[PDB]
């Protein structure tokens, strides 16, 4: 009964940028979901198609943990049917999403006096992301018909912008760590099970 390594996800030293969000596959283990839903530190814990307290009684084929860091007032965008820069261009959940979204304030970890510029988000795309799509392209965004040739300028914008988290920012602008758990259930032997 080897424990599922949820600590590797939730307790990692650094999280990924939302545009380059990270995914870890959890399989062949027993997951203690209680340590998640009985924790007081999560300011966002919202599940779809799943009851959080019941999770210790369910088995699944796989679990997928997507982790990233966003702005506080952008936490609302990590949900089905939402719009905005994060949902449109960075991380998109499907309408039929089956799983939980967990988020907590990480100002003490991801903010630096003078600004932490390691966390980025994508500003614009020609089209919205499809569910679970990932765009890590750093190509210059061509806003007009005049081409860009590796040169930023008028209607030629670099597509990634740094959050620049500072400890003195307002709570809506402070960093938040987000983990999205997706529960895959196929007609196959289940590999991720609760303690019961």
């Amino acid at each position, epitope marked *: 009964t080897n424990l599922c390594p949820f600590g590797e996800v939730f307790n990692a030293t650094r999280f990924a940028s939302v545009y380059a969000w990270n995914r870890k*596959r959890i*399989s*062949n283990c027993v997951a203690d979901y209680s340590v998640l839903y009985n924790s007081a530190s999560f300011s966002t814990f919202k599940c779809y198609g799943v009851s959080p307290t019941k999770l210790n009684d369910l088995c699944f*084929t*796989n679990v*997928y943990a997507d982790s990233f860091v966003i702005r506080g007032d952008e936490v609302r965008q990590i949900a089905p049917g939402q719009t905005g820069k994060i949902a449109d261009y960075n991380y998109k959940l*499907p309408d*039929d*999403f*089956t799983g939980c979204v967990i988020a907590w304030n990480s100002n003490n970890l991801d903010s630096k006096v003078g600004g932490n510029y390691n966390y980025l988000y994508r500003l614009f795309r*020609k*089209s919205n992301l*499809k*569910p*679970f*799509e*990932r*765009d*890590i*392209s750093t*190509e210059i965004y061509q806003a007009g018909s005049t081409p860009c040739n590796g040169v930023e300028g008028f209607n030629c914008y670099f597509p990634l912008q740094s959050y620049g988290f500072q400890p003195t920012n307002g709570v809506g602008y402070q960093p938040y760590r987000v983990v999205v758990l*997706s529960f*895959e259930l*196929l*007609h*196959a*032997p289940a*590999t991720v099970c609760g303690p019961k």
Partner: antibody, heavy 130, light 111 residues
């Protein structure tokens, strides 16, 4: 680390044939999808089907098919080291070398998306002729 | 409904030259899941690049992938004699049952 196709044979038009993909040096444990890609002599590559290798023994569930191949082709996991592809109603257009490939999958909700094909077997040749 | 156009059917360069192979998709490729494969005669396809730029293990760095969206390119900077083979692009989309391959491109080593 190795995949070996077998069962490719000379068959008459209208007949059925079942090909086998045998895994060597490892066993299926739910980490990949097993896929079939064919290539007519002198032509390009055409994807046929995939199946989750964590499926139950003898199951055809968790499978995806190209629209042209759906129903006429059946992919199954028969053991921890074998995946089969059953093809029916064969014609000369089905003459090809059939490759078995590991599919690296990406979970996308109610379905998975094949990211790429890493490991290809040498292939087995199917000749549909009288 | 999703077609990959691979041009041209044949490229050539001397030893040390650069050949460019284009792959155009009628629709944006999901998460830029564009991969390139090398097939030498009598051999199965061999993966060269995945995610449109990531080099597969053991593949020489002279093979380079680039592009995003609907336009992608395979570049062999420093063509060698054993690069004479057929190359294919393959795209993945927001779909569970369509993985088109490109028409293929032959690389001819000029001498």
């Amino acid at each position: 680390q190795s995949l070996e196709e077998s069962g490719g044979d000379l068959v008459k038009p209208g007949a059925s044939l079942t090909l086998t993909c045998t895994a060597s040096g490892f066993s299926f444990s739910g980490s990949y999808y097993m896929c079939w890609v064919r290539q007519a002599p002198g032509k390009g590559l055409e994807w046929i089907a995939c199946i989750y290798d964590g499926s139950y023994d003898g199951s055809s569930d968790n499978a995806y098919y190209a629209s042209w191949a759906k129903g006429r082709f059946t992919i199954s996991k028969t053991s921890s080291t074998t995946v089969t592809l059953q093809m029916t109603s064969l014609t000369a257009a089905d003459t090809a070398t059939y490759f078995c490939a590991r599919g690296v999958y990406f979970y996308a909700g109610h379905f998975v998306i094949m990211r790429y094909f890493v490991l290809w077997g040498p292939g087995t040749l199917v000749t549909v002729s009288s | 409904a999703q077609v990959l156009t691979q041009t041209p059917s044949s490229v050539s360069a001397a030893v040390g030259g650069t050949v460019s192979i284009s792959c155009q998709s009628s629709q944006s490729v999901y998460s830029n899941y564009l991969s390139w494969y090398q097939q030498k005669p009598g051999q199965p396809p061999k993966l060269l690049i995945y995610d449109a730029s990531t080099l597969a293990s053991g593949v020489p760095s002279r093979f380079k992938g680039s592009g995003s969206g609907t336009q992608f390119t395979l570049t062999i900077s420093g063509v060698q004699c054993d690069d004479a083979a057929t190359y294919y692009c393959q795209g993945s989309y927001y779909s569970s049952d369509w993985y088109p391959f490109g028409g293929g491109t032959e690389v001819v080593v000029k001498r």
